[PDB]
């Protein structure tokens, strides 16, 4: 019942604790930012993750997870439990007042994708291909929605730092993976990112309990959920990026594919 803890969840403080210097300074290439962006880039660049519809589970108030993704899917669905986040996403989608500045990220995305595109173009392609920001709950068998405006089955899935942060144990985690997995077509791809062996992280007045997980657990889970792991990489949190906003030890990136058998 973590749900009660997220109610105090402050998006502005969250973003600040994870997407501002030092973690949000994409200048140094040995950072979390460059790494996550690079994993995403390299994956889609293989051109094996392609389709029409794509869904991002547990978007929170961030967009970086779709900068490279938007290029390959015309219909995109952002999601998240807290409306405060859904609202925060909007301010950025609609270029509204005081939205969060994702420039540094957009630029580094264009830098890495090396397609020569400028960030405004990419940011515009994202805002364009993002259709709706739908409320979601990974704990429901039919993940938030009985008859959602979201095209199902989505041709692809993307989740960053969600599962481990809304599940109290490795069990709910599996159940949570199973759940969202139902939205993914039988050959669809899943790009999952998460915290490795972390157990808590601040976000303003709120204090979230998370499930410390390992690469092998994450793997076994993807498998035990019906996926065929294609790539599973792990970033180890450097010292300078270990502030007091959480206790993450490292970060994982998984390119999973729903077995078509
Ligand atoms: N039951 C639930 N189902 C889905 N998302 C949930 C949830 N409970 C909380 N969340 C959302 O899970 C997110 C974890 S934070 C990760 C945010 C974003 N992906 C970025 O990469 O950082 C929060 O935005 C929180 O609101
Ligand atoms: Cl870089 C980066 C980005 C997002 C998140 C973390 C890290 Cl380490 C881990 N701390 C908890 C919030 C999720």
Swiss-Prot record:
Changing residue 246 to A/N: Strongly reduced enzyme activity towards phenylethanolamine. Decreases affinity for phenylethanolamine 200-fold. Decreases affinity for S-adenosyl-L-methionine 3-fold. Gene3D superfamilies: Vaccinia Virus protein VP39. Octopamine binds at residues 198, 246. Its EC number is 2.1.1.28. Pathway: Catecholamine biosynthesis; (R)-adrenaline biosynthesis; (R)-adrenaline from (R)-noradrenaline: step 1/1. Inhibited by methyl methanethiosulfonate, phenylglyoxal, tetranitromethane and diethyl pyrocarbonate. Inhibited by 4-oxo-1,4-dihydro-quinoline-3,7-dicarboxylic acid, 4-(benzo[d][1,3]dioxol-5-ylamino)-4-oxobutanoic acid and 1,4-diaminonaphthalene-2,6-disulfonic acid. It catalyses: phenylethanolamine + S-adenosyl-L-methionine = N-methylphenylethanolamine + S-adenosyl-L-homocysteine + H(+); (R)-noradrenaline + S-adenosyl-L-methionine = (R)-adrenaline + S-adenosyl-L-homocysteine + H(+); (R)-normetanephrine + S-adenosyl-L-methionine = (R)-metanephrine + S-adenosyl-L-homocysteine + H(+); (R)-octopamine + S-adenosyl-L-methionine = (R)-synephrine + S-adenosyl-L-homocysteine + H(+). One of its GO terms (molecular function) is phenylethanolamine N-methyltransferase activity. The keyword Phosphoprotein applies. GO terms for cellular component: cytosol. Changing residue 77 to A: Significant decrease in protein expression and enzyme activity with octopamine as substrate. Keywords: Catecholamine biosynthesis, Methyltransferase, Phosphoprotein, S-adenosyl-L-methionine, Transferase. It is an enzyme of class 2 (transferase). GO terms for biological process: catecholamine biosynthetic process; epinephrine biosynthetic process; methylation. Changing residue 91 to C: No significant effect on protein expression and enzyme activity with octopamine as substrate. Changing residue 154 to T: No significant effect on protein expression and enzyme activity with octopamine as substrate. It comes from the Eukaryota. S-adenosyl-L-methionine binds at residues 14, 19, 58-59, 64, 80, 85, 137-138, 160. InterPro entries: NNMT/PNMT/TEMT_CS, NNMT_TEMT_trans, SAM-dep_methyltransferase, SAM-dependent_MTases_sf. NCBIfam families: GntF_guanitoxin (NF041360). PANTHER family: NNMT/PNMT/TEMT FAMILY MEMBER, PHENYLETHANOLAMINE N-METHYLTRANSFERASE. Catalyzes the transmethylation of nonepinephrine (noradrenaline) to form epinephrine (adrenaline), using S-adenosyl-L-methionine as the methyl donor. Other substrates include phenylethanolamine and octopamine. Also methylates normetanephrine. Belongs to the class I-like SAM-binding methyltransferase superfamily. NNMT/PNMT/TEMT family. This is Phenylethanolamine N-methyltransferase. It comes from Homo sapiens.
